[model samples]
Target: ASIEVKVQQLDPVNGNKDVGTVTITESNYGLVFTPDLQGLSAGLHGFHIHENPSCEPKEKEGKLTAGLGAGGHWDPKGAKQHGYPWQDDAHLGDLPALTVLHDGTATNPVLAPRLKHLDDVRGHSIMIHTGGDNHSDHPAPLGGGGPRMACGVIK
Candidate 1:
């Protein structure tokens, strides 16, 4: 099976913006991310497959947050933890880091061996965090992925 999902940008203030897309192929080699994104911090950022497919905004603890409506990472097995992408026991949503160039344009492919097909994430959202993901629970929570920078619903 082949899966191509577009990750549109969600702005808490200005609404939604078209960013780029991620295309996944059924090779166990993983999905490909083709980006023409902008307005992102130039550096390493956390990228993963979230549980929900909606990128709607919702208030959390009386504070407005970005992509709060997307829920958490895809953890169907209840691992309840974050680890390296290659770890079999790690969160199935875990993926390699998303590198943003100095110009803020991102283009790279992440390998998700755990995802056999699009069904694995057909109803989930793709998240881009404000910080880098170490894939470790230690030193920080959920690989220290900060606020949700951008998100897109998987239809």
Candidate 2:
């Protein structure tokens, strides 16, 4: 089956901005991610389905912020561990890291078996963090991805 989603970038200081689109499809291989995007740094970054649909600014520790409104990863069972996207014990919101090329283009496609349909992600927010996800607690928590750099409501 085939379905498409439009993903945008949420700038904490500037607000939401257009990144591009992702046409996600279902295959025996799992969910396929086809992203055509621009305007991001070159390298890998944290990517996932967050718990809310609002890209609006939020207050964390009494400080106004961006992307925090999207909430944490979709941990319906309250599992507080970060693992590979394919791990049965992994967080439901965990997805593969997003890669951007030197030209700031993300045309390559990635895949994960967790998300089966658009309905599973509706009303949630897709988020990109300032750092790459290590999929481990290592030197930091939640894959060590820094603060939210961008976000978009999945509608």
Candidate 3:
């Protein structure tokens, strides 16, 4: 069976905010994430599937904690790095970069792990970051997107 993902707007991080719903369709090979991004800045943004399902505001001024609710990327194989979203060794949550147009609209396609089923994200959170994911830790925090641009709990 396929899963239908619903995202609710949360607090904004940096200058970006979550505004609308995100739908994800799960399959044996991977999943397809469709985000309704409108009225956003035109540029590249980082997107990921967090571990936790709770979308409650993170403590410390709405800032997402190191592992606040949204646990590590759903890497079931214990991969330690990021790579192509479809690569078997990449983090389970690694997704394609979201691109916004001059009119503030975004549309991107992503492929995740084969092990992840519809139920996997049932209680986890989907997040969007202000910065871009370099797929490396050259800087720090596993290339964590600097701040939580937008957050929503899977429902």
Candidate 4:
């Protein structure tokens, strides 16, 4: 089975703006996330599943923040570190970097091999960060992806 999730830009000042949709399907080896999105900066960005299903702006540093309500990455196994999607020592939500073309569109598909079950992601939110993910904790925390850019609740 597969599901469609509508993504939106998380803006603190203007609120969520329509981005596009992501279709997720279960694969024999893992989960495949296909993005059909636009209106983002060109290049790679961090993509992951968050613990909460809500993408509402939450308070941070005394102001409304983007996608904070979604909480941290989903880590049901209690793997607190961030690592590559193929690694078991990382958060279950950790995914490969999402590539946005020079035209500001993301049509590529990313695979999360460790996430074998589709139901594991259904109640969470998918988030796109401002920068590319390094898939490590050092040098910068959480892959140094920066702030949340776009988000969508996985149904």
For every model shown, the clashing-pair count is 0, 1, 3, 0
- The deviation in Å at residue 85 for candidate 4 is 0.5
Off by over 4 Å in 1: 31-36
TM-score of 2: 0.88
The models' CA-based lDDT, in order, is: 0.79, 0.77, 0.64, 0.92
List TM-score per model, in order: 0.90, 0.88, 0.74, 0.97
Superior by lDDT: candidate 2 or candidate 3 = 2
Encode model 3's per-residue lDDT on 1-155: one tens digit a residue.
55545443344353324466667887567677777767665777677777777555546676554325565565656788866566677777777767766887766656665446667667677777667777766775546466555666776
> What's the distance in Å from true for residue 11, model 3?
2.4
- Give per-residue CA lDDT, model 2, range 1-155, as digits (tens): 55555666666565577888777677676777777889877889888878888767787888777678778888766667777788767777888998988988888887878777656777777777889998876778878877886676766
Q: RMSD in angstroms, all models?
A: 1.7, 1.9, 3.7, 0.8
Q: Which stretches of candidate 4 lie over 4 Å from their true place?
A: none
Instruction: Report the number of the highest-lDDT candidate.
Output: 4
- Model 2 bad stretches (over 4 Å): 1-3
Tens-digit per-residue lDDT, 100-155, candidate 4: 99999999999999988888888999999998799998889999988999999998
**Alpha-carbon lDDT of model 3:** 0.64
Per-residue lDDT of candidate 1, residues 1-155 (tens digit): 56667776677787777777766666647554445566677889898989888888889898777788888888998888899888888898998888888987787666776766666678888888888999998899889988888887666
Better of 1 and 3 by lDDT: 1
Candidate 3 residue pairs that clash? 52-124, 53-123, 53-124
lDDT of 4 at 70: 95
**Which stretches in model 3 have alpha-carbon errors above 4 Å?**
12-18, 27-29, 61-68, 113-116
